[PDB]
Design a protein around this ligand. Structure first.
Ligand SMILES: [K+]
Ligand SMILES: [Mg+2]
Ligand SMILES: [Mg+2]
Ligand SMILES: [Mg+2]
Ligand SMILES: [Mg+2]
Ligand SMILES: [Mg+2]
Ligand SMILES: [Mg+2]
Ligand SMILES: [Mg+2]
Ligand SMILES: [Mg+2]
Ligand SMILES: [Mg+2]
Ligand SMILES: [Mg+2]
Ligand SMILES: [Mg+2]
Ligand SMILES: [Mg+2]
Ligand SMILES: [Mg+2]
Ligand SMILES: [Mg+2]
Ligand SMILES: [Mg+2]
Ligand SMILES: [Mg+2]
Ligand SMILES: [Mg+2]
Ligand SMILES: [Mg+2]
Ligand SMILES: [Mg+2]
Ligand SMILES: [Mg+2]
Ligand SMILES: [Mg+2]
Ligand SMILES: [Mg+2]
Ligand SMILES: [Mg+2]
Ligand SMILES: [Mg+2]
Ligand SMILES: [Mg+2]
Ligand SMILES: [Mg+2]
Ligand SMILES: [Mg+2]
Ligand SMILES: [Mg+2]
Ligand SMILES: [Mg+2]
Ligand SMILES: [Mg+2]
Ligand SMILES: [Mg+2]
Ligand SMILES: [Mg+2]
Ligand SMILES: [Mg+2]
Ligand SMILES: [Mg+2]
Ligand SMILES: [Mg+2]
Ligand SMILES: [Mg+2]
Ligand SMILES: [Mg+2]
Ligand SMILES: [Mg+2]
Ligand SMILES: [Mg+2]
Ligand SMILES: [Mg+2]
Ligand SMILES: [Mg+2]
Ligand SMILES: [Mg+2]
Ligand SMILES: [Mg+2]
Ligand SMILES: [Mg+2]
Ligand SMILES: [Mg+2]
Ligand SMILES: [Mg+2]
Ligand SMILES: [Mg+2]
Ligand SMILES: [Mg+2]
Ligand SMILES: [Mg+2]
Ligand SMILES: [Mg+2]
Ligand SMILES: [Mg+2]
Ligand SMILES: [Mg+2]
Ligand SMILES: [Mg+2]
Ligand SMILES: [Mg+2]
Ligand SMILES: [Mg+2]
Ligand SMILES: [Mg+2]
Ligand SMILES: [Mg+2]
Ligand SMILES: [Mg+2]
Ligand SMILES: [Mg+2]
Ligand SMILES: [Mg+2]
Ligand SMILES: [Mg+2]
Ligand SMILES: [Mg+2]
Ligand SMILES: [Mg+2]
Ligand SMILES: [Mg+2]
Ligand SMILES: [Mg+2]
Ligand SMILES: [Mg+2]
Ligand SMILES: [Mg+2]
Ligand SMILES: [Mg+2]
Ligand SMILES: [Mg+2]
Ligand SMILES: [Mg+2]
Ligand SMILES: [Mg+2]
Ligand SMILES: [Mg+2]
Ligand SMILES: [Mg+2]
Ligand SMILES: [Mg+2]
Ligand SMILES: [Mg+2]
Ligand SMILES: [Mg+2]
Ligand SMILES: [Mg+2]
Ligand SMILES: [Mg+2]
Ligand SMILES: [Mg+2]
Ligand SMILES: [Mg+2]
Ligand SMILES: [Mg+2]
Ligand SMILES: [Mg+2]
Ligand SMILES: [Mg+2]
Ligand SMILES: [Mg+2]
Ligand SMILES: [Mg+2]
Ligand SMILES: [Mg+2]
Ligand SMILES: [Mg+2]
Ligand SMILES: [Mg+2]
Ligand SMILES: [Mg+2]
Ligand SMILES: [Mg+2]
Ligand SMILES: [Mg+2]
Ligand SMILES: [Mg+2]
Ligand SMILES: [Mg+2]
Ligand SMILES: [Mg+2]
Ligand SMILES: [Mg+2]
Ligand SMILES: [Mg+2]
Ligand SMILES: [Mg+2]
Ligand SMILES: [Mg+2]
Ligand SMILES: [Mg+2]
Ligand SMILES: [Mg+2]
Ligand SMILES: [Mg+2]
Ligand SMILES: [Mg+2]
Ligand SMILES: [Mg+2]
Ligand SMILES: [Mg+2]
Ligand SMILES: [Mg+2]
Ligand SMILES: [Mg+2]
Ligand SMILES: [Mg+2]
Ligand SMILES: [Mg+2]
Ligand SMILES: [Mg+2]
Ligand SMILES: [Mg+2]
Ligand SMILES: [Mg+2]
Ligand SMILES: [Mg+2]
Ligand SMILES: [Mg+2]
Ligand SMILES: [Mg+2]
Ligand SMILES: [Mg+2]
Ligand SMILES: [Mg+2]
Ligand SMILES: [Mg+2]
Ligand SMILES: [Mg+2]
Ligand SMILES: [Mg+2]
Ligand SMILES: [Mg+2]
Ligand SMILES: [Mg+2]
Ligand SMILES: [Mg+2]
Ligand SMILES: [Mg+2]
Ligand SMILES: [Mg+2]
Ligand SMILES: [Mg+2]
Ligand SMILES: [Mg+2]
Ligand SMILES: [Mg+2]
Ligand SMILES: [Mg+2]
Ligand SMILES: [Mg+2]
Ligand SMILES: [Mg+2]
Ligand SMILES: [Mg+2]
Ligand SMILES: [Mg+2]
Ligand SMILES: [Mg+2]
Ligand SMILES: [Mg+2]
Ligand SMILES: [Mg+2]
Ligand SMILES: [Mg+2]
Ligand SMILES: [Mg+2]
Ligand SMILES: [Mg+2]
Ligand SMILES: [Mg+2]
Ligand SMILES: [Mg+2]
Ligand SMILES: [Mg+2]
Ligand SMILES: [Mg+2]
Ligand SMILES: [Mg+2]
Ligand SMILES: [Mg+2]
Ligand SMILES: [Mg+2]
Ligand SMILES: [Mg+2]
Ligand SMILES: [Mg+2]
Ligand SMILES: [Mg+2]
Ligand SMILES: [Mg+2]
Ligand SMILES: [Mg+2]
Ligand SMILES: [Mg+2]
Ligand SMILES: [Mg+2]
Ligand SMILES: [Mg+2]
Ligand SMILES: [Mg+2]
Ligand SMILES: [Mg+2]
Ligand SMILES: [Mg+2]
Ligand SMILES: [Mg+2]
Ligand SMILES: [Mg+2]
Ligand SMILES: [Mg+2]
Ligand SMILES: [Mg+2]
Ligand SMILES: [Mg+2]
Ligand SMILES: [Mg+2]
Ligand SMILES: [Mg+2]
Ligand SMILES: [Mg+2]
Ligand SMILES: [Mg+2]
Ligand SMILES: [Mg+2]
Ligand SMILES: [Mg+2]
Ligand SMILES: [Mg+2]
Ligand SMILES: [Mg+2]
Ligand SMILES: [Mg+2]
Ligand SMILES: [Mg+2]
Ligand SMILES: [Mg+2]
Ligand SMILES: [Mg+2]
Ligand SMILES: [Mg+2]
Ligand SMILES: [Mg+2]
Ligand SMILES: [Mg+2]
Ligand SMILES: [Mg+2]
Ligand SMILES: [Mg+2]
Ligand SMILES: [Mg+2]
Ligand SMILES: [Mg+2]
Ligand SMILES: [Mg+2]
Ligand SMILES: [Mg+2]
Ligand SMILES: [Mg+2]
Ligand SMILES: [Mg+2]
Ligand SMILES: [Mg+2]
Ligand SMILES: [Mg+2]
Ligand SMILES: [Mg+2]
Ligand SMILES: [Mg+2]
Ligand SMILES: [Mg+2]
Ligand SMILES: [Mg+2]
Ligand SMILES: [Mg+2]
Ligand SMILES: [Mg+2]
Ligand SMILES: [Mg+2]
Ligand SMILES: [Mg+2]
Ligand SMILES: [Mg+2]
Ligand SMILES: [Mg+2]
Ligand SMILES: [Mg+2]
Ligand SMILES: [Mg+2]
Ligand SMILES: [Mg+2]
Ligand SMILES: [Mg+2]
Ligand SMILES: [Mg+2]
Ligand SMILES: [Mg+2]
Ligand SMILES: [Mg+2]
Ligand SMILES: [Mg+2]
Ligand SMILES: [Mg+2]
Ligand SMILES: [Mg+2]
Ligand SMILES: [Mg+2]
Ligand SMILES: [Mg+2]
Ligand SMILES: [Mg+2]
Ligand SMILES: [Mg+2]
Ligand SMILES: [Mg+2]
Ligand SMILES: [Mg+2]
Ligand SMILES: [Mg+2]
Ligand SMILES: [Mg+2]
Ligand SMILES: [Mg+2]
Ligand SMILES: [Mg+2]
Ligand SMILES: [Mg+2]
Ligand SMILES: [Mg+2]
Ligand SMILES: [Mg+2]
Ligand SMILES: [Mg+2]
Ligand SMILES: [Mg+2]
Ligand SMILES: [Mg+2]
Ligand SMILES: [Mg+2]
Ligand SMILES: [Mg+2]
Ligand SMILES: [Mg+2]
Ligand SMILES: [Mg+2]
Ligand SMILES: [Mg+2]
Ligand SMILES: [Mg+2]
Ligand SMILES: [Mg+2]
Lengths: 48, 275
RNA sequence: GCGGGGUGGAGCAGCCUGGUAGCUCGUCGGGCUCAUAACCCGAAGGUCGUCGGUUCAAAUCCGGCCCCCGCAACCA
RNA sequence: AAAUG
RNA sequence: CCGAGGGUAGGGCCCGUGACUGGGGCGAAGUCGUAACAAGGUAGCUGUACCGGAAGGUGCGGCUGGAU
RNA sequence: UGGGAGAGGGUGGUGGAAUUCCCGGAGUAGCGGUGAAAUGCGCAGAUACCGGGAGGAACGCCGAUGGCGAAGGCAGCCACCUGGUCCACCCGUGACGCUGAGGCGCGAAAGCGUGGGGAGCAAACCGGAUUAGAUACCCGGGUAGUCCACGCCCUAAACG
RNA sequence: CGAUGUCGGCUCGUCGCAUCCUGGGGCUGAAGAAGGUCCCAAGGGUUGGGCUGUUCGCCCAUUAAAGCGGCACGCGAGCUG
RNA sequence: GAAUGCCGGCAUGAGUAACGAUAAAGAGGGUGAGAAUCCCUCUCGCCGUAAGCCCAAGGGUUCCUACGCAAUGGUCGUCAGCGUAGGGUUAGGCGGGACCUAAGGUGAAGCCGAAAGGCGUAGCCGAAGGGCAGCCGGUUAAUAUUCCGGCCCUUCCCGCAGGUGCGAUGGGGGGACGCUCUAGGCUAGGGGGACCGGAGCCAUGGACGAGCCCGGCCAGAAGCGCAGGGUGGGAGGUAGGCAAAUCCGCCUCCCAACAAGCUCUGCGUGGUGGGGAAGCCCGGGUGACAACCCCCCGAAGCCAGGGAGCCAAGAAAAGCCUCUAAGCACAACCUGCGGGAACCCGUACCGCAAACCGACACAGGUGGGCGGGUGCAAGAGCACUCAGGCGCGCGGGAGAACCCUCGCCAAGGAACUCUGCAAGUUGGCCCCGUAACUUCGGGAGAAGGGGUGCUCCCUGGGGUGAUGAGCCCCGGGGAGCCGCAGUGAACAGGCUCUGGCGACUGUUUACCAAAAACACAGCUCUCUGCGAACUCGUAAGAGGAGGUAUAGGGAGCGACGCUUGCCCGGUGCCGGAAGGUCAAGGGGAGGGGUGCAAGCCCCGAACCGAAGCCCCGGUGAACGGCGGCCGUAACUAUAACGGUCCUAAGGUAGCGAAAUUCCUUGUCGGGUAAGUUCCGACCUGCACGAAAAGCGUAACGACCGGAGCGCUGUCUCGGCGAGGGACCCGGUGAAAUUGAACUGGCCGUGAAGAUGCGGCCUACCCGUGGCAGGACGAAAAGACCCCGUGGAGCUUUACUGCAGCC
RNA sequence: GAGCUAGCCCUGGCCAGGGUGAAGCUGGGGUGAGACCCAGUGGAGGCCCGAACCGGUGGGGGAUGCAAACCCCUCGGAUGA
């Protein structure tokens, strides 16, 4: 049947993307937190 | 004069339609339409705040002239009578000798080709707008302002009207469509006549789909829900109310009054409504 | 198993608070009527389901037994 | 108020 | 080919019969009341409507085939 | 041709008396009701009286043994639309008449449908009385209905 | 109770005998025939259908007869549900 | 040494199940160390509204070539979407940006919130909508509307000429709109041709033929032609379109009116440039100077912003045109021509799938366009088949039980079973014919029957065209022929009678419930006078609604028909300027502490003092409720009638052993040979009953009962056959589970059901196909039950708070 | 976290073919005029049959599956909520 993952680059960038993160106290905390952890990628990669 | 159908489907048995015999023009005035932004019953938070709304026919909004004291003394001609999907009344297209074009809601008896006028000097004739103080006592009137220059607020639905009952100081006394007796200010404008399309009340929707065309989504009873949802929810099998019948939010709904006590307009209401 | 009840012939009070049995109807006698009903006047009829106890004294309070209503008998 | 044979 | 008829299927009229049910008729005498005939003790009758153990009652309108 | 009398019919408009309700005033111990009462209403200010307002229905005197219509039936007043009918003149057509199975239309009240309206009245219903009882008569209430529009019903002691 | 799946049916049987039939008997209020009753006997046999989920039961048509019980009210790592 | 412990390693089950759709294979020849599996040819089968082709999303080099086969590939591998390396994606016109707006998002002004932040008109962002200029062929191993060739076109800049009051973010027009049905003319696509072009072919009994087989076009500027869309011209007045306006709107006059004209599309033609089969010979070359024509069918596509009808009444903004404003009229704009200028990103490849979403090369899921031919009434259905693509990445044998999917069956025909569950039957079209009942539509495809192929003869109407020939589409009549059988294959209703429930079409528990549940038109109560009520939010602000009582919210009931009784004592809600109670506050009789004292400080009675409650009323389609005992009639029975107690009032109509009836399989009747179900009655209704509606109701239902006809392997009662497995051989090779095991029967015993104890009995060692009685077999720390002063959802006149409201 | 799912908002797209034959309109009859009746035309509808598409009724299979909901036969809707 139709499964849960239906990839869509525009949706991915708008929902989880860097600029969505910086727009919001919680999203800026995600970025600060993944930096402090040393994540190589702060945000999901998506091609555009 | 509502029209019936023959029982060639189950739903056509009782479905009725308007006769549409007063309409003379079947597309709106382009300079006077603007998009109606459908809401779905959702507010600026995105929340349903009025349940069971959505999914009706698309509609353009026809701008309506609820002031009319905008163009005192400038007569106009009734150029057409048109369908308006945003209200029960029909609307009338006015061609002012000014060259300006406006819409008004169409009173009963208004004829395409006649002339209308607004102002203190206007004849007491169907379709004319005067301040309440210049209309003779006893006249049936419609599209009545509720405060000076704030716009017609009363009696705008198909077939409705208000009747002037008497006067007292700067205020005249009106019987509203609800049967309430209110004091309205004398400088408030109104329009001689009753709103047309009085047969509107006698329309039988006929089937479920018709409500859906009107943006009316299926309403579901509290009694059919669970206790998480509604005071009437639950019970094994069917169940009576088991308490004072209540809204989804708990407040009583058979008889419990709800107008604010200390509301300033109380001084100007003489008698709560009838029946 | 839990609650209520049994008192003239019928249906009900009195029991809770021990000493005093009461109301309507019916029954009997007499009136009125030609007569009957209705109506009026007077009367009789209950030892209180039963046995046992407490008490100076028990329809009344406490037990046993009989009888009649009502409720319950669920997870299984 | 006043039924019946 | 037609064709007595036989067969299959679906209809129409009539008759008989049927748990039960509806009122009707008849059979002197029981139970309940007293609706009508006198102004029958609320004049009656009436078409209709609602009601009631029963006759009946009441409403609206009609008739005199109503007394005084 | 010229005249006439009439609640004949339909539409719209309009007048005053009264009942009820509401607001103001003035006022106090009862009002109402019956055979007599009670229910009911009233010191939370009723009834009775004065002023104002809203609304519905019916039209007093004239009025009669009267008039009109085929019948049912029709009554304040005004205007419009319209039917029937009698009279005089003796002018016109020249039997063009009478009746009428069917058919069609009209048809008190009650009743029914969809709206509206709702003062008074009032089946049902409730209460107070009476009574052996009183699902009645009498009393206090009171919903349909009575009123309007449209559409049905088609009955009668629709009788002279 | 860190699981022993529970009524009835179907399928497959197997055992007990307090024996439904068939075999052998005694007593009889056993004339014959047909029964009654008790004794011996478990080798075999012990039908099809209507109703109900039913087991049971009633009923229809037959039969030599239309037995009663146990096997985790036999049998769901065999089926049904 | 144990914790269903943790991490790791390795065992067992086992050479076992499986190797992923039953569309299918065989042989020859190549390559190579090795070949069922790679390459080539021939034969066979499968898809063909796809299993072919083209877009979009997503994926991200998977594309092409060379060289490889350790691992990946369910086997193999010389092959590959795998490993290494090299190569490959070319645009002014296609898509997106340098254009526009939609929901939404953001947001100068402004508003709000302890902080964080929440709003908000304009503006800005935002597309698969609007707008906008490229068609055909060739070429590469791999890209092409991109390169090349031909023929076209757009914008910007500069210039030249001609023209004009030029000029805008401002005004205005336009852009600009639904659903259904649909005209005319075209095109796409297709069928046929006795005509045109073509390498050839004559087989096996016949044909050298008007034979067979193949093909008979594509793009195109101006002009022209055909078919359509769009659009009135002039003048005068002018107060409206937030300045102005010659524009637009409004008024009057004159001409014009299915037209015409002007303008814009489509189609045809068109200089020109392209393509071009079978067959044969090694992707190529020849065919070829290829031919390129006639008739018919014909869209849902085009002309298009066409037409008609209908109600539910159907985006915006820019491009564009017009109008003027500052300004400027050496400018500036319009038109024609010329030169120049024209940026950024995507472009490979898969794309119904082995490359996307499902952990897999996974029988699942994935939006748009094309989707040929014949026949079957039609069609995108069905069978076959073209182009094109495939035989599904383990095979070879065997021909047991058993399983799956399938075929047939003597006699019977539901006897099967909870149930005709399942499977038969029926089945398309044309004609004849069709009942109760009904809301007059329907019920209806009711039921039931007949016809159906092929040949010849005769003939009626229509389209194209010409009025004819031909072609094409509907039919009509007569005479015949063959078979068991003519919708000869494939696709395609079993029917009737009768109850229950729900009016109906709809909706639901994604993944055990599709229903009688939800919803539904309709009915009633109730709230709401507008800054409405109500809802969301601390607020601002929103929804309600740019709506206004014929409207909006809440609640119950649930088409329709005939109806919906009695109780207001309790609770609720509504009304009630009295009275009772009533907090803060006011008041301050009268007391107190302290100081020498003026004083400072405290307690404090009456009395005034909201809502709420008490109290008085109303109210049921408000919560709800609608009796008991005893007697009584021709000497039976029963009780119309009566007595008495209680209540706020004692269940009305209608219905009733019912989706409700305990006793119960009530009793009687019907149907059956037999009827716990069913249907019709009765009424002692354990425990119907009137909008948690009562009783009915045509039509409807994958709902739940009962019955009959038809027909059947459901059954008596089973038999045979088919294929895919199971079985054997070669390849690859799991799993839960497992204290260890050298693991028998009976009768006992034992923590009460023993392979493991006792006594007896039986028993050579080890496997393979099978069956499931046991190993209290496996799985899941029982979901029932209890326990825990464990948890959570839900309720209320439990307690205590809070929001909210007064 | 609404790339699954539920509702709504904006903007697009899709629904082979066949059947039934409402209103209206035209004509004819009818009548004082009417209603109304007949025929033709017309093309309505949460109408009918049936693909795509959307479903998920009954059964069988599957059950360490092809699949953590699938396959086959059958069946519901298919201009509309
Ligand atoms: K339980
Ligand atoms: Mg899904
Ligand atoms: Mg998605
Ligand atoms: Mg995207
Ligand atoms: Mg996208
Ligand atoms: Mg997105
Ligand atoms: Mg999205
Ligand atoms: Mg976001
Ligand atoms: Mg972002
Ligand atoms: Mg912050
Ligand atoms: Mg790094
Ligand atoms: Mg992140
Ligand atoms: Mg109708
Ligand atoms: Mg009709
Ligand atoms: Mg109209
Ligand atoms: Mg606009
Ligand atoms: Mg809005
Ligand atoms: Mg917003
Ligand atoms: Mg709401
Ligand atoms: Mg809503
Ligand atoms: Mg509205
Ligand atoms: Mg309107
Ligand atoms: Mg005012
Ligand atoms: Mg209405
Ligand atoms: Mg609408
Ligand atoms: Mg509902
Ligand atoms: Mg519920
Ligand atoms: Mg529920
Ligand atoms: Mg919730
Ligand atoms: Mg709660
Ligand atoms: Mg609750
Ligand atoms: Mg409840
Ligand atoms: Mg419930
Ligand atoms: Mg219940
Ligand atoms: Mg429930
Ligand atoms: Mg209750
Ligand atoms: Mg409540
Ligand atoms: Mg009011
Ligand atoms: Mg007493
Ligand atoms: Mg006492
Ligand atoms: Mg005493
Ligand atoms: Mg319990
Ligand atoms: Mg008297
Ligand atoms: Mg007597
Ligand atoms: Mg014969
Ligand atoms: Mg009498
Ligand atoms: Mg009398
Ligand atoms: Mg009397
Ligand atoms: Mg009475
Ligand atoms: Mg008093
Ligand atoms: Mg006083
Ligand atoms: Mg009034
Ligand atoms: Mg003469
Ligand atoms: Mg009448
Ligand atoms: Mg008395
Ligand atoms: Mg009524
Ligand atoms: Mg246990
Ligand atoms: Mg275990
Ligand atoms: Mg276990
Ligand atoms: Mg013998
Ligand atoms: Mg034996
Ligand atoms: Mg049985
Ligand atoms: Mg048992
Ligand atoms: Mg039994
Ligand atoms: Mg024998
Ligand atoms: Mg046994
Ligand atoms: Mg057991
Ligand atoms: Mg037992
Ligand atoms: Mg037992
Ligand atoms: Mg068992
Ligand atoms: Mg099982
Ligand atoms: Mg079992
Ligand atoms: Mg087991
Ligand atoms: Mg076992
Ligand atoms: Mg240890
Ligand atoms: Mg552990
Ligand atoms: Mg571990
Ligand atoms: Mg290691
Ligand atoms: Mg390990
Ligand atoms: Mg290992
Ligand atoms: Mg091994
Ligand atoms: Mg094994
Ligand atoms: Mg396996
Ligand atoms: Mg497998
Ligand atoms: Mg298959
Ligand atoms: Mg094979
Ligand atoms: Mg081979
Ligand atoms: Mg090699
Ligand atoms: Mg190989
Ligand atoms: Mg090899
Ligand atoms: Mg192979
Ligand atoms: Mg094809
Ligand atoms: Mg991938
Ligand atoms: Mg390898
Ligand atoms: Mg290898
Ligand atoms: Mg290597
Ligand atoms: Mg591998
Ligand atoms: Mg694999
Ligand atoms: Mg490449
Ligand atoms: Mg180019
Ligand atoms: Mg630029
Ligand atoms: Mg805050
Ligand atoms: Mg954006
Ligand atoms: Mg775009
Ligand atoms: Mg473009
Ligand atoms: Mg190259
Ligand atoms: Mg110019
Ligand atoms: Mg437009
Ligand atoms: Mg528009
Ligand atoms: Mg659009
Ligand atoms: Mg529409
Ligand atoms: Mg072309
Ligand atoms: Mg063709
Ligand atoms: Mg001007
Ligand atoms: Mg075009
Ligand atoms: Mg060639
Ligand atoms: Mg199309
Ligand atoms: Mg178009
Ligand atoms: Mg059009
Ligand atoms: Mg806009
Ligand atoms: Mg100059
Ligand atoms: Mg740039
Ligand atoms: Mg490319
Ligand atoms: Mg697929
Ligand atoms: Mg596709
Ligand atoms: Mg692929
Ligand atoms: Mg998976
Ligand atoms: Mg594969
Ligand atoms: Mg072809
Ligand atoms: Mg066909
Ligand atoms: Mg294969
Ligand atoms: Mg073998
Ligand atoms: Mg198969
Ligand atoms: Mg057979
Ligand atoms: Mg048979
Ligand atoms: Mg049969
Ligand atoms: Mg059967
Ligand atoms: Mg059955
Ligand atoms: Mg079943
Ligand atoms: Mg077939
Ligand atoms: Mg056939
Ligand atoms: Mg019949
Ligand atoms: Mg018929
Ligand atoms: Mg029938
Ligand atoms: Mg019927
Ligand atoms: Mg009919
Ligand atoms: Mg047939
Ligand atoms: Mg043949
Ligand atoms: Mg069919
Ligand atoms: Mg339902
Ligand atoms: Mg239903
Ligand atoms: Mg119904
Ligand atoms: Mg439907
Ligand atoms: Mg489910
Ligand atoms: Mg579930
Ligand atoms: Mg689930
Ligand atoms: Mg269903
Ligand atoms: Mg539901
Ligand atoms: Mg319904
Ligand atoms: Mg209704
Ligand atoms: Mg209503
Ligand atoms: Mg809130
Ligand atoms: Mg708004
Ligand atoms: Mg419902
Ligand atoms: Mg009926
Ligand atoms: Mg009450
Ligand atoms: Mg009350
Ligand atoms: Mg009260
Ligand atoms: Mg209660
Ligand atoms: Mg109560
Ligand atoms: Mg007696
Ligand atoms: Mg006797
Ligand atoms: Mg009644
Ligand atoms: Mg019964
Ligand atoms: Mg019943
Ligand atoms: Mg019951
Ligand atoms: Mg029973
Ligand atoms: Mg029972
Ligand atoms: Mg029985
Ligand atoms: Mg019988
Ligand atoms: Mg009985
Ligand atoms: Mg209720
Ligand atoms: Mg109920
Ligand atoms: Mg249904
Ligand atoms: Mg159903
Ligand atoms: Mg049957
Ligand atoms: Mg049968
Ligand atoms: Mg078989
Ligand atoms: Mg085989
Ligand atoms: Mg061997
Ligand atoms: Mg091997
Ligand atoms: Mg391997
Ligand atoms: Mg060991
Ligand atoms: Mg060992
Ligand atoms: Mg062993
Ligand atoms: Mg052994
Ligand atoms: Mg033991
Ligand atoms: Mg043992
Ligand atoms: Mg042993
Ligand atoms: Mg041992
Ligand atoms: Mg030992
Ligand atoms: Mg041993
Ligand atoms: Mg031993
Ligand atoms: Mg042994
Ligand atoms: Mg082996
Ligand atoms: Mg085996
Ligand atoms: Mg075993
Ligand atoms: Mg076992
Ligand atoms: Mg165990
Ligand atoms: Mg076991
Ligand atoms: Mg645990
Ligand atoms: Mg446990
Ligand atoms: Mg557990
Ligand atoms: Mg304990
Ligand atoms: Mg505790
Ligand atoms: Mg404890
Ligand atoms: Mg606890
Ligand atoms: Mg409130
Ligand atoms: Mg989603
Ligand atoms: Mg469709
Ligand atoms: Mg379409
Ligand atoms: Mg037909
Ligand atoms: Mg027709
Ligand atoms: Mg028309
Ligand atoms: Mg349909
Ligand atoms: Mg059909
Ligand atoms: Mg089946
Ligand atoms: Mg499963
Ligand atoms: Mg199928
Ligand atoms: Mg269908």
């Amino acid at each position: 049947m139709k499964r849960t993952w239906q990839p869509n680059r525009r949706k991915r960038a708008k929902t989880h993307g860097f600029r969505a993160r910086m727009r919001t106290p919680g999203g800026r905390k995600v970025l600060k937190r993944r930096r402090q952890k040393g994540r190589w990628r702060l945000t999901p990669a998506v091609r555009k | 004069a509502v029209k019936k159908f023959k029982p060639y489907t189950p739903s056509r048995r009782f479905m009725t339609v308007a006769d549409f015999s007063e309409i003379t023009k079947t597309e709106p005035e382009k300079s006077l339409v603007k998009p109606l932004k459908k809401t779905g019953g959702r507010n600026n938070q995105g929340r349903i705040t009025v349940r069971f709304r959505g999914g009706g026919h698309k509609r353009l909004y026809r701008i309506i002239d609820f002031k009319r004291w905008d163009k005192v003394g400038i007569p106009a001609k009734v150029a057409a009578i048109e369908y308006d999907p945003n209200r029960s009344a029909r609307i009338a297209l006015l061609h002012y000798v000014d060259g300006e074009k406006r819409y008004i809601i169409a009173p009963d008896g208004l004829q395409v080709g006649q002339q209308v006028v607004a102002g203190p000097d206007a004849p007491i004739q169907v379709g004319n707008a005067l301040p309440l103080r210049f209309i003779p006592v006893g006249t049936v009137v419609h599209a009545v302002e509720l405060e000076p220059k704030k716009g017609a607020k009363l009696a705008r639905a198909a077939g409705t009207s208000a009747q002037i009952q008497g006067r007292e100081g700067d205020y005249v006394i009106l019987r509203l469509p609800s049967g309430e007796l209110r004091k309205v200010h004398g400088e408030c404008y109104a329009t001689v006549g009753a709103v047309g399309n009085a047969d509107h009340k006698n329309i039988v929707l006929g089937k479920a789909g018709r409500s859906r065309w009107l943006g009316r989504r299926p309403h579901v009873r509290g009694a059919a829900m669970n206790p998480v949802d509604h005071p009437h929810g639950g019970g094994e099998g069917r169940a009576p109310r088991g308490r004072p019948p209540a809204s989804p939010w708990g407040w009583q709904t058979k008889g419990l009054k709800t107008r604010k006590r200390r509301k300033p307009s109380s001084r100007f209401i003489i008698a709560r409504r009838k029946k």
